[PDB]
Amino acid sequence: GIREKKAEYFAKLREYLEEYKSLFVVGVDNVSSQQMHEVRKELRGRAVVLMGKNTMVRRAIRGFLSDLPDFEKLLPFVKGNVGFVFTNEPLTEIKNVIVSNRVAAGLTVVQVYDNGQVFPXXXXXXXXXXXXXXXXXXXXXXX
Amino acid sequence: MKYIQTEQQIEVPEGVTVSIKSRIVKVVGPRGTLTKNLKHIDVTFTKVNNQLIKVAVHNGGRKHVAALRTVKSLVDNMITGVTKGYKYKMRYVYAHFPINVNIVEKDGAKFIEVRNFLGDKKIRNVPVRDGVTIEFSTNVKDEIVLSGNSVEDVSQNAADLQQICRVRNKDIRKFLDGIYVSHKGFITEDL
RNA sequence: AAUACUGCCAGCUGGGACUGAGGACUGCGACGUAAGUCAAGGAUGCUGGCAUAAUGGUUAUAUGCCGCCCGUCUUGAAACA
RNA sequence: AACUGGCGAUGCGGGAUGAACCGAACGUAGAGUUAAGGUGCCGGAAUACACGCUCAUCAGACACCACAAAAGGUGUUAGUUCAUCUAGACAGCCGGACGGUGGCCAUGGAAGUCGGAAUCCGCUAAGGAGUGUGUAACAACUCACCGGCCGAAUGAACUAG
RNA sequence: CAGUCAAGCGUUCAUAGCGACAUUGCUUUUUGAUUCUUCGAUGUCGGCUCUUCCUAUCAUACCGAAGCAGAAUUCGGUAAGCGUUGGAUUGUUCACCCACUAAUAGGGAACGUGAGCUGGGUUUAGACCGUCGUGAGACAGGUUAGUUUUACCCUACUGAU
């Protein structure tokens, strides 16, 4: 039987999807488990890379709609070499970490970022009368 | 256990034109042409629109699948021949006795002088299977270049050409020489 | 509502084959008021030809199927008895 | 040797063949009807019909009755059970795979990987007192692991046609 | 004669080469039981001759695998195509030398082969010794010599017309 290792291995792997709500697709094929063992000797900072044979885990990641149905998203990362990461750092703070060293071998706008300025997303995209009519302002204060 | 509709679903590119005479295909590629008697498979062959062709067996069987998958394999082998074509490179081995190798000609038959075959006054001579087309691999000792359009055009030529130097008479699990292979390739390389 | 199933009718119509054994009469019967009928102890009506080897026997021939010498012993003989 | 039944003493219908086996025993006959036994050809009588197995470089085709085993076989067929089992592994392919650490080191070497000795903290998504190789040692490669795809198969015990 | 199995051997290593204990089949070319046929009898030794069969193959042909540098091996497949000797002693069958080959495989044919050969042994009556018996006699004790017909018939076969 392998399905109870998918109930155990995806009890603990299908588990932490809403425990740790961040995505880090690590590209570790052909994995130097020597070095990636010594990774763990280094891994007493934040987290551990936790991968899977994602066509054997295909129907498991088909089983990953459970907690935040956004965690089926490792079937959009099945080809390429791919698996799982558990931490609470929000966007791109662990994918920069696992791939480099010792390795295998929504949101709105109230801040338009134009040239280090601080837009309220109402300055550049204004009414063209809150400044275009103010072209005659100090022309009027001039004359 | 008689899977209820079995088929092979093969994308067709656009440099090729075939014509399946009710089982009998008229294959044409940018290199050349092939055909096959396919009246030993009993399918309905299936153009969709010059970009895929299936075969069709209503309720195919188990060993029928055990050959019916690689039906597609060998078809695609024929695609690579009729478009692109294989081009291997082989090896020669001696250690002490310098074997002369030549494509000597017997009337276009294109034999091969094999001389000093470990001190043999007997000479070997290997004719060329034509269709697969051979130049000497220049700048490299003990190599040669075959180039055909079947994987047995070139690997049956390399198979029995490999069977040229089946060497006997000594402790040959120690004594190791002969026609070997280096490489397998393509007539249009990078194709 | 149909239908399967089964049983019943001492309901109704085609074809085959086989037979007339027996000889006054009884009897048994039924059916018709009776007369009389009948199928009720076994068959009685209408042709045509030959009138002879016709039919049939016979021999011989020929055909389809079957076919271990007698006599003897033994439990056991066609017996290499 | 103790029971029933035949031959003897008894023929006829089935077993190509058959003393003692399957039916059934014996007046002459004739009309209907069957056993035993069967219905490709001989061959009488259905290459009748229905559901499946099998393909045999040594099928098979039977009470009587005139024959193989142990041991097997990724042959086939189907199931039975167990563990991964779509949560994707698997297959296939895409990379490294430890800082402390050559742990204590036995150290002419041993740097993870001759060899004794305990087997660490961590680190990850991975790194092992190292998974081997490469090793004066090694470096480094490597492998667990973890990182890319696929949609489902994996592993074990079988079980008997 | 052939397996199955492996305790182990084989430096190590079960399986190159072997193999403890166990187990499954095969053969009549060996011996036991056996009395169907023969006592109104089917030429029983040995040899000679001569042919054929068989395979479980000696050599010769092709191949494969090893605990197969050459050389020299083992084990296996295909394999019966063709081949697989001469003399001393002993009637011998048997046996043993001595010598030769590529090699000097193994069995069947009414224990193939006497209207095919011989008759050396075997086995009347004659005779001798050693043993045993009163004796008539007995001795797988030894020894000696002591009567091999016929197809012109059928089949078979081969020539012949």
Swiss-Prot record, chain A:
Sites of the Glycyl lysine isopeptide (Lys-Gly) (interchain with G-Cter in ubiquitin) crosslink: K12, K95
Modified residues (Phosphoserine): S66
Subcellular location: Cytoplasm
Described purpose of this protein according to its UniProt entry: Component of the ribosome, a large ribonucleoprotein complex responsible for the synthesis of proteins in the cell. The small ribosomal subunit (SSU) binds messenger RNAs (mRNAs) and translates the encoded message by selecting cognate aminoacyl-transfer RNA (tRNA) molecules. The large subunit (LSU) contains the ribosomal catalytic site termed the peptidyl transferase center (PTC), which catalyzes the formation of peptide bonds, thereby polymerizing the amino acids delivered by tRNAs into a polypeptide chain.
Subunit record text: Component of the large ribosomal subunit (LSU). Mature yeast ribosomes consist of a small (40S) and a large (60S) subunit. The 40S small subunit contains 1 molecule of ribosomal RNA (18S rRNA) and 33 different proteins (encoded by 57 genes). The large 60S subunit contains 3 rRNA molecules (25S, 5.8S and 5S rRNA) and 46 different proteins (encoded by 81 genes). The 5 acidic ribosomal P-proteins form the stalk structure of the 60S subunit. They are organized as a pentameric complex in which uL10/P0 interacts with 2 heterodimers, P1A-P2B and P1B-P2A. uL10 directly interacts with 28S rRNA.
Entry's family note: Belongs to the universal ribosomal protein uL10 family.
Protein name (database record): Large ribosomal subunit protein uL10
Lineage: Eukaryota, Fungi, Dikarya, Ascomycota, Saccharomycotina
Covered residues, full protein: 3 to 198 of 312
Swiss-Prot record, chain B:
A biological process from GO: cytoplasmic translation
One Pfam family hit: Ribosomal_L6
PANTHER family reported for this sequence: 60S RIBOSOMAL PROTEIN L9, 60S/50S RIBOSOMAL PROTEIN L6/L9
Assembly mode: Component of the large ribosomal subunit (LSU). Mature yeast ribosomes consist of a small (40S) and a large (60S) subunit. The 40S small subunit contains 1 molecule of ribosomal RNA (18S rRNA) and 33 different proteins (encoded by 57 genes). The large 60S subunit contains 3 rRNA molecules (25S, 5.8S and 5S rRNA) and 46 different proteins (encoded by 81 genes). uL6 lines the binding pocket for eukaryotic elongation factor 2 (eEF2).
Annotated PROSITE patterns: RIBOSOMAL_L6_2
Protein name, as recorded: Large ribosomal subunit protein uL6A
Similarity comment text for this entry: Belongs to the universal ribosomal protein uL6 family.
Keywords, alphabetical: Cytoplasm, Ribonucleoprotein, Ribosomal protein
Keyword Zinc-finger carried by entry: no
Intracellular or extracellular location(s): Cytoplasm
Protein's job: Component of the ribosome, a large ribonucleoprotein complex responsible for the synthesis of proteins in the cell. The small ribosomal subunit (SSU) binds messenger RNAs (mRNAs) and translates the encoded message by selecting cognate aminoacyl-transfer RNA (tRNA) molecules. The large subunit (LSU) contains the ribosomal catalytic site termed the peptidyl transferase center (PTC), which catalyzes the formation of peptide bonds, thereby polymerizing the amino acids delivered by tRNAs into a polypeptide chain.
